[PDB]
Amino acid sequence: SVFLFPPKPKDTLMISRTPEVTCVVVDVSHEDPEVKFNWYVDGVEVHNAKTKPREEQYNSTYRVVSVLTVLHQDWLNGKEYKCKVSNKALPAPIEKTISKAKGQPREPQVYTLPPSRDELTKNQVSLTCEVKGFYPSDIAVEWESNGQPENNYKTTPPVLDSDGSFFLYSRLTVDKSRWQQGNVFSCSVMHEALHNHYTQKSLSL
Amino acid sequence: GGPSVFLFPPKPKDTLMISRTPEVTCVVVDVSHEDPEVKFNWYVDGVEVHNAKTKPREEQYNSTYRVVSVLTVLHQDWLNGKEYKCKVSNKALPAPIEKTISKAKGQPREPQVYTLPPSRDELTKNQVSLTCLVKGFYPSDIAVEWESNGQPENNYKTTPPVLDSDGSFFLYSKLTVDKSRWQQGNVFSCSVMHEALHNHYTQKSLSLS
Numbered sequence A: 001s002v003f004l005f006p007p008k009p010k011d012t013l014m015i016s017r018t019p020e021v022t023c024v025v026v027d028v029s030h031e032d033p034e035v036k037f038n039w040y041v042d043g044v045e046v047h048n049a050k051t052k053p054r055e056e057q058y059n060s061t062y063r064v065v066s067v068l069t070v071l072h073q074d075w076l077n078g079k080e081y082k083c084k085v086s087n088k089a090l091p092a093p094i095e096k097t098i099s100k101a102k103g104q105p106r107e108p109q110v111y112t113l114p115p116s117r118d119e120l121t122k123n124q125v126s127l128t129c130e131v132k133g134f135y136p137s138d139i140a141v142e143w144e145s146n147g148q149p150e151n152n153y154k155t156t157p158p159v160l161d162s163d164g165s166f167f168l169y170s171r172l173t174v175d176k177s178r179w180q181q182g183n184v185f186s187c188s189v190m191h192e193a194l195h196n197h198y199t200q201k202s203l204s205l
Numbered sequence B: 001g002g003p004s005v006f007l008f009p010p011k012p013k014d015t016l017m018i019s020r021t022p023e024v025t026c027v028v029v030d031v032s033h034e035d036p037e038v039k040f041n042w043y044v045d046g047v048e049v050h051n052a053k054t055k056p057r058e059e060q061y062n063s064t065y066r067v068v069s070v071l072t073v074l075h076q077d078w079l080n081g082k083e084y085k086c087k088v089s090n091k092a093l094p095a096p097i098e099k100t101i102s103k104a105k106g107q108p109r110e111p112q113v114y115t116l117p118p119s120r121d122e123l124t125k126n127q128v129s130l131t132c133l134v135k136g137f138y139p140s141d142i143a144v145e146w147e148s149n150g151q152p153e154n155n156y157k158t159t160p161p162v163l164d165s166d167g168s169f170f171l172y173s174k175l176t177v178d179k180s181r182w183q184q185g186n187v188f189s190c191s192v193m194h195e196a197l198h199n200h201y202t203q204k205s206l207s208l209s
């Protein structure tokens, strides 16, 4: 079986990062272990992909994986990436294709929300970052304070809204004492439809 | 390429309200014309039970049959973590197919429910978001609704439950309303149903401070 996966949203938005499309072949037998990959961008064979080392599963099968480096702007411009897998246990080669969601990108609106008054009776308080109105659903969200990453947060998956855009929430949990000291926290959002693919909103007592 | 079986749980509100009828549903698809006969057996914690309601096979547009069996469950049995097993027999199969379902294992934990008003920055728009944060609950089986003046507010969306660092779940529900209605002092309410709540229910209100 073959499964094709898109790049991580953050990887396509920063030129320093390395976006990759991943073709994953599962249920590779010990009897027929060999597996070949062929890659195509908009139908044209490209030759820069590389096949990774494999791992054995608890059901005594092999997961084999190939990774193709893509050009940030090619992905964002909607190029189609086709993988083709060939193996002796497969009657014919399996092909899979993927590309970015189609349609007009829409800029996220980013709002920060202080903790509930009713949560402020707790030891830790939640700071919320609502991100709404964005399209496609590919997005990344992080938190920081004083130019340093704040990693004690969780983010919901994007949810389809009634207007065809997406929204999500990110929740940073912090010690109530930090909040009370007037420390400034910032929700950072990366999306293709933002200027320079990035915006930040701050939240403070 | 024989039959495939799918086993579906009851809906969360169905186990939480005695007025409702919770059911587990066993569905068999890809049943062939060459071997069209299917038998179900049902088990609750491994003990066979005989009160399921099974429907005659229905041919699909792809010339295979779909056959459904429905077992009514007792609310407290589900909430007590009983395991429901559907066994499907068909003479083409090498052995019967068995699937099991139950409530997620672990100690239940009561949701904390908080309401959050619109961001000041959002109050320049024609419509604004009212947020209901629901956190610290386990299992993830939950229902969230909005009302105002005892009437459903239907213009809302809820995130799926998300696993938190401490093993519990959280989610957010977002009610979009006209800014006018918010500024007029209308009270909106977020109601939550979960097994760890007292009477399986709680409600929290939100209006212009």
Ligand SMILES: *[C@@H]1O[C@H](CO[C@@H]2O[C@@H](C)[C@@H](O)[C@@H](O)[C@@H]2O)[C@@H](O[C@@H]2O[C@H](CO)[C@@H](O[C@@H]3O[C@H](CO[C@H]4O[C@H](CO)[C@@H](O)[C@H](O)[C@@H]4O[C@@H]4O[C@H](CO)[C@@H](O)[C@H](O)[C@H]4NC(C)=O)[C@@H](O)[C@H](O[C@H]4O[C@H](CO)[C@@H](O)[C@H](O)[C@@H]4O[C@@H]4O[C@H](CO)[C@@H](O)[C@H](O)[C@H]4NC(C)=O)[C@@H]3O)[C@H](O)[C@H]2NC(C)=O)[C@H](O)[C@H]1NC(C)=O
Residues within 6 Å of the ligand: A001, A003, A005, A006, A022, A024, A026, A027, A057, A058, A059, A061, A063
């Ligand atoms: C033996 O075991 C191995 C390993 O399994 C593991 O081992 C045992 C011990 C247990 O603990 C298992 O629970 C454990 O998983 C089995 O290998 C598995 O093989 C199955 C196929 O049978 C694969 O299922 C597919 O999974 C993809 C999603 O996969 C991502 O997410 C997984 C976690 O959720 C993760 O495990 C995967 O690695 C992968 O993760 C991503 O990886 C990429 C690349 O590295 C990375 O870039 C991503 O960031 C990363 N993301 C995450 C979240 O981690 C899923 O998409 C597939 O679903 C489609 O296909 C199904 C049909 O098979 C269908 O039912 C679905 O609906 C869906 O169908 C598609 O739907 C779309 C619309 O939604 C539609 O447009 C498409 O047309 C349609 N496509 C169709 C029809 O295919 C699918 O579920 C597992 O990935 C794989 N596990 C691993 C670890 O690789 C093996 O099966 C076992 N062998 C036996 C017993 O026979």
Ligand SMILES: *[C@@H]1O[C@H](CO[C@@H]2O[C@@H](C)[C@@H](O)[C@@H](O)[C@@H]2O)[C@@H](O[C@@H]2O[C@H](CO)[C@@H](O[C@@H]3O[C@H](CO[C@H]4O[C@H](CO)[C@@H](O)[C@H](O)[C@@H]4O[C@@H]4O[C@H](CO)[C@@H](O)[C@H](O)[C@H]4NC(C)=O)[C@@H](O)[C@H](O[C@H]4O[C@H](CO)[C@@H](O)[C@H](O)[C@@H]4O[C@@H]4O[C@H](CO)[C@@H](O)[C@H](O)[C@H]4NC(C)=O)[C@@H]3O)[C@H](O)[C@H]2NC(C)=O)[C@H](O)[C@H]1NC(C)=O
Residues within 6 Å of the ligand: B004, B006, B008, B025, B027, B029, B030, B060, B061, B062, B064, B066
């Ligand atoms: C021939 O036709 C039949 C009938 O289809 C119909 O007719 C044809 C001609 C076409 O026109 C079709 O468009 C038309 O629908 C085909 O039958 C289908 O077969 C597939 C499998 O090949 C089944 O796929 C599974 O679907 C379930 C979800 O099913 C619910 O939701 C569907 C819509 O989203 C809906 O269509 C279904 O009716 C069903 O709806 C629910 O019904 C219950 C009971 O009545 C009800 O209580 C609910 O309210 C209702 N819900 C909704 C939303 O309506 C999906 O869960 C399955 O995914 C699991 O298994 C996959 C492997 O097969 C795997 O990849 C997934 O990851 C997933 O795995 C599970 O993951 C979860 C969490 O991660 C975990 O808890 C589980 O343990 C794990 N499962 C395991 C153990 O693996 C799967 O995708 C279709 O349901 C089925 N259709 C119908 C109507 O029965 C048939 O395939 C055709 N044959 C051929 C050869 O083409």
